[PDB]
Amino acid sequence: QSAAATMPLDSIDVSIPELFYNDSVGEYFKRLRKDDPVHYCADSAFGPYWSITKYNDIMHVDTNHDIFSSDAGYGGIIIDDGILDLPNFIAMDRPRHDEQRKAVSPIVAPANLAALEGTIRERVSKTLDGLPVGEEFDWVDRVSIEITTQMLATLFDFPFEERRKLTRWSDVTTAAPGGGVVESWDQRKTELLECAAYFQVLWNERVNKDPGNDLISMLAHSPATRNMTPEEYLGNVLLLIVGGNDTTRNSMTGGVLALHKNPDQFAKLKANPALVETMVPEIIRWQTPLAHMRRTAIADSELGGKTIRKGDKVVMWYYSGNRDDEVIDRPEEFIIDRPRPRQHLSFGFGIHRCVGNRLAEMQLRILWEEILTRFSRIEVMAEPERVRSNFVRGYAKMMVRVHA
Ligand code: HEM
Numbered sequence: 450q451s452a453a454a455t456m457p458l459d460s461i462d463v464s465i466p467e468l469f470y471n472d473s474v475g476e477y478f479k480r481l482r483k484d485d486p487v488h489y490c491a492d493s494a495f496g497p498y499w500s501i502t503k504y505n506d507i508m509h510v511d512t513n514h515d516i517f518s519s520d521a522g523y524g525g526i527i528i529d530d531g532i533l534d535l536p537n538f539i540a541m542d543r544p545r546h547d548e549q550r551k552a553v554s555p556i557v558a559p560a561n562l563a564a565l566e567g568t569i570r571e572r573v574s575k576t577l578d579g580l581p582v583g584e585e586f587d588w589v590d591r592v593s594i595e596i597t598t599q600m601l602a603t604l605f606d607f608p609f610e611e612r613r614k615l616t617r618w619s620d621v622t623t624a625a626p627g628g629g630v631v632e633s634w635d636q637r638k639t640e641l642l643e644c645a646a647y648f649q650v651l652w653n654e655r656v657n658k659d660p661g662n663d664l665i666s667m668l669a670h671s672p673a674t675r676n677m678t679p680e681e682y683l684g685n686v687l688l689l690i691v692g693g694n695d696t697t698r699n700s701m702t703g704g705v706l707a708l709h710k711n712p713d714q715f716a717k718l719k720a721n722p723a724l725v726e727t728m729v730p731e732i733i734r735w736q737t738p739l740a741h742m743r744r745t746a747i748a749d750s751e752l753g754g755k756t757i758r759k760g761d762k763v764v765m766w767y768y769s770g771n772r773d774d775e776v777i778d779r780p781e782e783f784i785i786d787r788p789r790p791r792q793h794l795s796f797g798f799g800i801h802r803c804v805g806n807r808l809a810e811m812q813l814r815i816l817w818e819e820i821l822t823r824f825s826r827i828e829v830m831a832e833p834e835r836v837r838s839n840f841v842r843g844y845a846k847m848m849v850r851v852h853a
Contacts, residue, residue, distance in 0.1 A: 487753035703736030
């Protein structure tokens with residue numbers, strides 16, 4: 450591959466998934482932020498697109514939804530244009546998005562989340578109490594996937610023993626025949642109707658009981674949801690499951706890798722466990738579990754001296770903006786005690802900013818509070834295998850050992 454530092458600017462294609470896989474893409478982003486920060490690529494595997502590489506420019510795009518649209522009709526919200534017809538509120542503009550999002554934001558209520566803490570902690574405690582000590586195991590399988598699946602079961606108060614159903618339904622939602630996940634579109638449809646039937650049982654059992662602190666109770670007792678159709682219910686449930694699943698997984702894996710690579714920060718965290726609160730947002734900045742989101746321009750506009758034309762694909766590279774030293778001090782450093790650790794892009798900004806963020810951060814905080822009480826070190830034994838994606842910045846496997 451060409452040297453990012455000196456190659457022609459017009460040869461730089463940051464969408465190439467291999468560059469995320471081998472984790473060199475950061476070098477190309479570094480070159481763009483310095484030398485062409487609103488960067489047009491005329492030809493790629495995804496078609497032509499703009500790369501928005503700097504923190505303030507990315508915020509401008511994300512918070513200007515009347516110019517930069519998320520609508521599924523234009524191709525949706527990933528660089529790769531999109532294809533059972535369920536409303537998908539992340540790929541929707543005003544006014545429809547707002548009522549679908551308002552249904553669900555009870556999950557943003559700190560009051561509500563506070564009621565889940567004890568359940569989260571007991572579930573994390575049991576997993577960590579079961580890990581081998583001094584023996585190698587796959588952190589991704591044993592902790593990240595396991596704990597994320599708990600977090601979704603907690604959110605829905607889903608029958609805990611059946612929680613693997615949630616990750617199966619997550620896998621099916623983005624599957625296509627030939628992939629070895631589903632063998633046909635019928636099977637996929639059949640499984641997602643089984644999901645709708647299950648969640649409908651849950652709703653039927655809860656609507657006439659005192660409400661719990663889970664989402665299904667809250668939706669069922671909330672007067673705002675009177676006119677919520679079964680398609681909206683299923684679309685909301687699958688969007689939450691997908692939105693929470695790999696992002697939280699990769700944040701759980703990422704913070705272990707960061708602390709291994711910065712053992713001085715891990716020394717500071719053990720000496721002051723209260724830093725868990727300011728460390729969790731740093732993990733999320735450092736990992737940038739979703740590396741981009743995309744938009745489509747619906748009107749000409751100017752950005753960074755460039756004209757972005759109506760119809761053009763515009764890619765907000767959150768992973769780049771989270772390395773932008775004009776906003777973030779020493780951005781390549783993992784620092785668990787920054788003064789404003791929530792100054793990052795990993796959750797986006799604007800009307801589509803992550804609705805799950807407070808639940809993710811609570812889950813991550815409780816995870817680490819519970820690690821710190823148990824283990825003196827979490828040692829990464831081999832370079833983890835990364836995911837080959839330009840969207841998911843994540844890890845398929847990471848071998849570790851824990852020490853008492
Ligand atoms: C560290 C974990 C997470 C990260 C890094 C993350 C990231 C993001 C990003 C980048 C967006 C779009 C932001 C934008 O376009 O401006 C988003 C939206 C969203 N996320 Fe999260 N997310 C995480 C966890 C969660 C969790 C735990 C849930 C569910 C419980 C969730 C549910 C959603 C939903 C439903 C949306 C769509 C919001 C809307 O369109 O109004 N996410 N997330």
